[PDB]
Amino acid sequence: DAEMAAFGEAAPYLRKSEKERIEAQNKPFDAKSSVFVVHPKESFVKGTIQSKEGGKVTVKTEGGETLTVKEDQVFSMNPPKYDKIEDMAMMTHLHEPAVLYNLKERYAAWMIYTYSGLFCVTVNPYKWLPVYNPKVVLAYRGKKRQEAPPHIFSISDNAYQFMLTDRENQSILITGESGAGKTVNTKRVIQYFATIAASGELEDQIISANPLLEAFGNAKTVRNDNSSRFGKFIRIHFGATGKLASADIETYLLEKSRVTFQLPAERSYHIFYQIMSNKKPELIDMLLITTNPYDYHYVSQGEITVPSIDDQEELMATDSAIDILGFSADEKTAIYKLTGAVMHYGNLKFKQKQREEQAEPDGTEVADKAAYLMGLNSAELLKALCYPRVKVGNEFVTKGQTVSQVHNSVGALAKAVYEKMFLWMVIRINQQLDTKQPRQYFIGVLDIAGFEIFDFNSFEQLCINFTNEKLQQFFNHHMFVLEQEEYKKEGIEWEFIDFGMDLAACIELIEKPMGIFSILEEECMFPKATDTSFKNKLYDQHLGKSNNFQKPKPAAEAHFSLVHYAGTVDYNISGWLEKNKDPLNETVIGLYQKSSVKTLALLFATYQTVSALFRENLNKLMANLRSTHPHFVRCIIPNETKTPGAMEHELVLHQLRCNGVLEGIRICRKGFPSRVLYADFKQRYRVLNASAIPEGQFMDSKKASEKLLGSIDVDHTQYRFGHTKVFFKAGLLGLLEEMRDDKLAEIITRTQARCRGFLMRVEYRRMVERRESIFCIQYNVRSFMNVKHWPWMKLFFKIKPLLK
Amino acid sequence: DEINDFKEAFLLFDRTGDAKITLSQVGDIVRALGQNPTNAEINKILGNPSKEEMNAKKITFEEFLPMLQAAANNKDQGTFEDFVEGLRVFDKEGNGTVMGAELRHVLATLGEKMTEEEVEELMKGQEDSNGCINYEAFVKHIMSV
Amino acid sequence: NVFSMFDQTQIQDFKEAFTVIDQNRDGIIDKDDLRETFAAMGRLNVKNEELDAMIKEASGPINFTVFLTMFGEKLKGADPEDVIMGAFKVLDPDGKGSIKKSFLEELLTTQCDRFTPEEIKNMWAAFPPDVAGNVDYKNICYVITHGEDK
Known part of the structure; x- marks a missing residue:
């Protein structure tokens, strides 16, 4: 209250009034009866325990319902002291329900930022809040997260701090599902940096960035109309002083497959449709295309038009952005020209040479265009494509391909080229976001999607999931490292294995040599391979031999399931081979490498499959992530229905598992929470077996506590000693106290008595004293009552005065 | 039963003149006649039956004296050993240090209770301005009747 | 006597x-x-x-x-004023300001057989105002030794 001023107006959404708190923490609570429980319709609802079926439980509800559920369908409930805890990880009850419930409660109160360990949970308000308030920004400036309530600027400032304090680079990992609202945060974090440390004695480029990436890495999904296919990583390069110096963008998965394919209700990247919109007619003639997408198979397999989108407007947006972004016209020309070649490729047709099973060009109509647009030679191109000249042994062996092999290789380049380009654009962006001024550290802001599970999981899902399963391990480790410091700082004696390790199994299976990707990228080299082919290769080699590898359990279709940290994902392998081809025909790449179109030439100097990069990029990333002090942010989406102050349970529950939140709680609940300092241990509990006495009293502040635990019908496991303190699991210390509690009833009840006794013992000494003084008073009065009416006495009375 | 003085003391707490004291005053008269009894113990035998204790101590000396003797048997618990020590367990920071607030609430809210009035009366100028009370001296002034 | x-x-x-x-x-x-x-x-x-x-x-x-x-x-049960005041000073034991009506109502009726509830109401009427205000024991003593009007 006193503190809060800075925010003032925001306060109510950050923290609650000091009595709202007080009125909440200090209220009646019945532990033994109050509980959380399973629930068929609603995930977990709260209730009161009624009876006990010996291993069954009957509970009342909060709404009024009675259910008899297992013993482990029942979960404790935190004392009121933990109402709307800033850090759920401080709770003494690390459950599934308690976490759901905490989030939920502080949301219904309009608090969107609650921490769950290291995380910074964030829930979509679905309405407006004074939080991004220009007052807050300052408020959170120079404050450890313990000096202020849960908020993103906390994370964001601390990073900065830490940045200059430790002289280490930092990172912020934002992640959540499609509707969680990450961009929003990301952006908001970014502003934060710019504001709190500006040396413009960007802001648009920064912005303009999006609308370019979006044209290339975004598309109409059956769910969204502008779905991100994209991810991103910005490096804000801070200077030496601590003032801004550079930036760096990188784009991921704008989903290579879209470029060549598209589901029926979906569509490819926007750009294509943007361009064919005709707002800049030159473009159409320049690229040598038409305005009717049905001329480009690659891009009209699904849908072409979306009512909520104005391809014409965007085209400019895009266009203009390029410019602002500082691209050269030429490059700005490459981009375009290059984006059309790709369309053309999908139009490239072939035919079987007679009496031969070879592929021979079915015309030089399109090739011509593709060739020209890329700064290539039609012929040279069609040859390389048809008669791929390989290098098996120590030479270069000319190999012939099939019709099916070509169509697939083409597609592989189409994809390859698009990708690379996209990567380049990002780099170029980053470059502008390029100054000469020195750089000492940076703060990376990573925005990507999180593990999403769909009834239908295709190639794109694997790529993303894989990304996340990595990111997760990345955390689990940082936590292991982190944890272990405490037990080292304190002196507790806790040994434990890296928490990452648990996931290495899954990762190896994907990224290692005889793993999925490889088998995937090899087969891409076989001119006559099938999805089916690929499939078998996948099995013959991993099935039965690999645990994380499994065959789908029918319940669409599925070819293989994997066992990721979040759960089992059923993957469908159909199109993969293609999508993955956009293995790359190196002869062709050769040509690119010597194009008249510099840019094209550039893109391929580091020289091929699609997944081949994804990996390379994902490595370059996870490496950048390492030379970083990881800072985590988990974005959450309340209800599919878009309603502020509401939350579907199971929907949030999901996210929590796939988030890492529930895994951070797990790992938390494994160590030794409560840790008692030895003297603090003596005093409070001596009474339990106080006699573990001559040798427990001539004594040591440490060895004592040791000796003490000698008694009690307690788990001699659950604790652990060390140089400055004991370590204890949960509900133990709780157990201790209880025993203690009884021990005072003893102590008190007995001490009361004597008192009571004694108290009255003094009453008798008074009663007795009084004995006569009363009588005196007693009789004395009586006299008077009798006398006062007697002549003689009245006489004496009037007369009594004249005397002396 | 037997001794004489206790019969003389019964009339001093009659408060009617009938020589028949009540089943409630029962629990208090027992406290000054030599040695302590707890409330829960008095409440247990003969106390818990209202008509029987009213016809077994809300009465003449005949049932007073046997109830009082029944209490006399358990009174070995008068041992002071545990009862300076139990106190040091609440506020142990060097000497027999206590804080007023801790003994005041602990002996009003816990186990057998005690009225705030009676607790204020146990604290009869033994806890001066310093906030801290000296344990070892209280058990002596408490046991000193 | x-x-x-x-x-x-x-x-x-x-x-x-x-x-x-x-x-x-x-x-x-x-x-x-x-x-x-x-x-x-x-x-x-x-x-x-x-x-x-x-x-x-x-x-x-x-x-x-x-x-x-x-x-x-x-006057077979009547003392001189100072002696009567001593009995009240014992009931006062803390000193100077005299006692309340309830405290002595009970102590005259309780230990022994009776200072009867007829006698006690006559007391509040014939000992006053005094008995209402400070149960003015000083005054009570002066009226019993020195007459009713005084």
């Missing part, structure tokens, strides 16, 4: 009181001695039956001793 409390001072107060009613100085008060002491105090309306009622309380001539015995006999 009447010579056992009864200090020399009390007895001298009585001796002087007798010599003021003793008009003739002879040593015996009679009807005549009573008549002009009443007259000297302002009371002229005195009827023989009242004078006679006074004298009838004694069996002989009213002589110093017969007086002292007759007046002692009516």
